[PDB]
Amino acid sequence: AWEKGMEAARALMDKYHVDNDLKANFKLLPDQVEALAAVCKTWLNEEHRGLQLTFTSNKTFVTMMGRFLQAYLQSFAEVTYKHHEPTGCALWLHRCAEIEGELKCLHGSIMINDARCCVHDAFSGKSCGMFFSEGAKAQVAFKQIKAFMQALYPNAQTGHGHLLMPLRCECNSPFLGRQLPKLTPFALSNAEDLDADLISDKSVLASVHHPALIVFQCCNPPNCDFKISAPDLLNALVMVRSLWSENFTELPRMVVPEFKWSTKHQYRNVSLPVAHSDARQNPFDF
């Protein structure tokens, strides 16, 4: 029902006063996100001025929101597009937080070696792109997110083992290099010197117990300024859920794909010939 979501969308665009220009061209097409991001930015500025982001670009934050909102409107109106997932993310079952010292790449193969890399990198060829300079700092980052998710979702059936990772950056919208956004582990310096027996906020306790964050950046840091931390991405989902419920009450079913490895994600080394347009009917003259 294209009309349904088409309308529910303009309502939000009216309420949060989006430029009639942006407001007029939106037709709920596969990748019209600017308007929805506009709605989310105005909402944030209104009901959430105290939003602090840790290792995340503000522009990236409101863009992810737009993607998650586009997902909901589509899921609400029951609108599908043959080859387009709105969120642009996927759920990776990161088994990096179980056996200590044992990290794993997108392939499902244990990272091989202080440093760690994709088995097929003993990066190029049939690799995924995952490399870690300091393996220790990496597992800390994966443990932290596992903690954060349990603090946020205390008693849940599943979810703590997955990782809401983005599949596309501002570029994936073929090219050489990594096909997925790079995930570089960052360290939390100040968190390292706080007494763990602090305030009852368990989400903050996660960072304190594991001072490192998984930060997703552009596939190849063409490239772009895409930057966003794991927890901030999760917040981006939760906040859009809030926004939705605040206006429509019931949250429609919106499923974000479970990541399954395939050759299409492989690190691309050689290019493929692309044709340069020619304003000629015939190739040669003779």
Nearer to a second copy, 120 or 241 (CB): 241
- Considering the rule CB under 8 A, would residue 189 count as an interface residue with a second copy? yes
What backbone torsions phi and psi does residue 189 show, to the nearest 5 degrees? -65, -55
- Considering the rule CB under 8 A, would residue 201 count as an interface residue with a second copy? yes
Nearer to a second copy, 111 or 163 (CB): 163
The response to whether 96 counts as a known ligand-binding position is no
Task: Please list every residue from 32 through 61 that binds a second copy, using CB under 8 A.
Answer: 52-55
The response to whether 84 counts as a known ligand-binding position is no
Task: Please list every residue from 207 through 246 that binds a second copy, using CB under 8 A.
Answer: 207-208, 213, 229, 231-232, 234-235, 238-239, 241-242, 245
Q: How far is CA 107 from CA 81, 113, 269, in A?
A: 28, 16, 18
Other Cβ atoms within 10 Å of 4 Cβ, number: 14
* Torsion from C-alpha of 178, 180, 182, 183, nearest 10 degrees: -140
CB of 19 to a second copy, least distance (A): 27
Which segment (7-15, 20-28, 92-100, 200-208) binds a second copy by CB under 8 A? 200-208
For the chain, the residue count is 286
Q: List Cβ neighbours of 131 (8 Å cut-off, separation of 6 or more).
A: 115, 116, 117, 118, 121, 123
HEC sequence for 186-227 = EECCHHHHCCCCCCCCHHHHHHHHCCEEEEEECCCCCCCCCE
The response to whether 171 counts as a known ligand-binding position is yes
Q: List Cβ neighbours of 47 (8 Å cut-off, separation of 6 or more).
A: none
Q: Which of 188, 214, 218, 219 binds a second copy (CB under 8 A)?
A: 188
Nearer to Zn ion, 16 or 123 (CB): 123
Residue 173 binding: pick among Zn ion, a second copy, none (C-beta 5-8 Å cut-off by kind): none
Which residue numbers belong to the known binding site for Zn(2+)? 105, 107, 118, 128, 169, 171, 218, 224
